[PDB]
Curated annotation (Swiss-Prot):
The gene is plc. Ca(2+) 3 binds at T272, D273, N297, D298. One of its GO terms (cellular component) is extracellular region. Binds 3 Ca(2+) ions per subunit. Residues 247-255 are annotated as: Linker. Gene3D superfamilies: P1 Nuclease, PLAT/LH2 domain. Keywords: Calcium, Cytolysis, Hemolysis, Hydrolase, Metal-binding, Secreted, Signal, Toxin, Virulence, Zinc. Bacterial hemolysins are exotoxins that attack blood cell membranes and cause cell rupture. Constitutes an essential virulence factor in gas gangrene. Binds to eukaryotic membranes where it hydrolyzes both phosphatidylcholine and sphingomyelin. The diacylglycerol produced can activate both the arachidonic acid pathway, leading to modulation of the inflammatory response cascade and thrombosis, and protein kinase C, leading to activation of eukaryotic phospholipases and further membrane damage. Acts on human and mouse erythrocytes, but not on rabbit or horse erythrocytes. Changing D269Y: Binds less Ca(2+), small decrease in PLC, sphingomyelinase and myotoxicity, increased hemolytic and cytotoxic activities. Ca(2+) 1 binds at D269, G271, D336, A337. Zn(2+) 1 binds at W1, H11, D130. This is Phospholipase C. Residues 1-250 form the Zn-dependent PLC domain. Its main location: secreted.
Length: 370
């Protein structure tokens, strides 16, 4: 969907309505903590809205042109065994971004950083809105500097007439209750989001593609925006319950992948063009290393980069991973020191490592996170 850097536009409307939806569907018997956390969210509305639009204008990334259209089955294909060269990190998808920002949002909320938590939640919903955008051509036709397309700008001009204020039921009813049953957040998110994304693809072929009439387009915007709002409300509801009842999705399950969220210091020359790797060592002495390389310019000064690592051994618990590290290898003979500011490691929807560093890493050296 379309959006503007100041927290306005289609994206902002979606999260704003997601809140109103909850304000209306929330049953009276709901735990007061849930209702109280909803109120904290509402008073941080401007941050939720800013976060909901930020990913299309994020300048602390890889210096790449924005393109947020993925085939709904991408995440599922990446999750399958054998289908990926493990030495390489897995590319970020709309599906994975929802999970990452959700984990970061939960972590921040538990420690009282409501403003940051809400912003992160906004970013998670931004990506959910995207996968719910009915635009799936093989070849994209961008119309603005932020990578938006004509179907999104069309919906943008009409956003007000697509607003909904209810999911169609109360939180004690099926839609909402089903969302709480699956205690495995990452597993629930995958199936839940995939449903909206696939319906989105169907709508692209039957109503939103360029060859369809304006009437078809209006209808497509209407039904996918309703879906986006409802779906967003569902994610916010789950977040509220997760942070209120102190829920942890990683609870004793196998760690199939690890996600590194690395914040490079804003200091001059903090970034690096040298080869960068991440590695772990298990309690039993096993080791695995991955190359941290995404399509763009990795580890730029002041960037917040994400790397998804798929593990060899799929029978490991989080406590089985004893050490973790990042390692630099010189690209050229010339110096190019690297200064990470903070590194967060996420395992099964939980932020398991949050280490401030602010030290220069130079030459061919290994820096131990743990
Ligand atoms: Ca670089
Ligand atoms: Ca790269
Ligand atoms: Ca440098
Ligand atoms: Zn969008
Ligand atoms: Zn986007």
């Amino acid at each position: 969907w379309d959006g503007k850097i100041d927290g306005t536009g289609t994206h902002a409307m979606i999260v704003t309505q997601g809140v109103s939806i909850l304000e209306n569907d929330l049953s009276k018997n709901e735990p007061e903590s849930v209702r109280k956390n909803l109120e904290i969210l509402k008073e941080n509305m401007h941050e939720l809205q800013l976060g909901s639009t930020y990913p299309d204008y994020d300048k602390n990334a890889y210096d790449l042109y924005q393109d947020h259209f993925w085939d709904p089955d991408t995440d599922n294909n990446f999750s399958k065994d054998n289908s990926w060269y493990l030495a390489y990190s897995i590319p970020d998808t709309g599906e994975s971004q929802i999970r990452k920002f959700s984990a970061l949002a939960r972590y921040e909320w538990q420690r009282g950083n409501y403003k940051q938590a809400t912003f992160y939640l906004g970013e998670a919903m931004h990506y959910f809105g995207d996968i719910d955008t009915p635009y799936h051509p093989a070849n994209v036709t961008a119309v603005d500097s932020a990578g938006h397309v004509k179907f999104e700008t069309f919906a943008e001009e009409r956003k007000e007439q697509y607003k909904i204020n209810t999911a169609g039921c109360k939180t004690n009813e099926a839609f909402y209750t089903d969302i709480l049953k699956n205690k495995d957040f990452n597993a629930w998110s995958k199936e839940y989001a995939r449903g909206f994304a696939k319906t989105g693809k169907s709508i692209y072929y039957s109503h939103a593609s360029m060859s369809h009439s304006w009437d078809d387009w209006d209808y497509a915007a209407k039904v996918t925006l309703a879906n986006s709002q409802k779906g967003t409300a569902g994610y916010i509801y789950r977040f509220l319950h997760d942070v209120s009842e102190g829920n942890d999705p990683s609870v004793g399950k196998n760690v199939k992948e690890l996600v590194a969220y690395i914040s490079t210091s804003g200091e001059k020359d903090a970034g690096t063009d040298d080869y960068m790797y991440f590695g772990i060592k298990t309690k039993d002495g096993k080791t695995q290393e991955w190359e941290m390389d995404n399509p763009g310019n990795d580890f730029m000064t002041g960037s917040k980069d994400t790397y998804t690592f798929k593990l060899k051994d799929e029978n490991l618990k989080i406590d089985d991973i004893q050490n973790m590290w990042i390692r630099k290898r010189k690209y050229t003979a010339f110096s190019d020191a690297y200064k990470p500011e903070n590194i967060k490691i996420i395992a099964n929807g939980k932020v398991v490592v949050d280490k401030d560093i602010n030290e220069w890493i130079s030459g061919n050296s290994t820096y131990n996170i743990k």
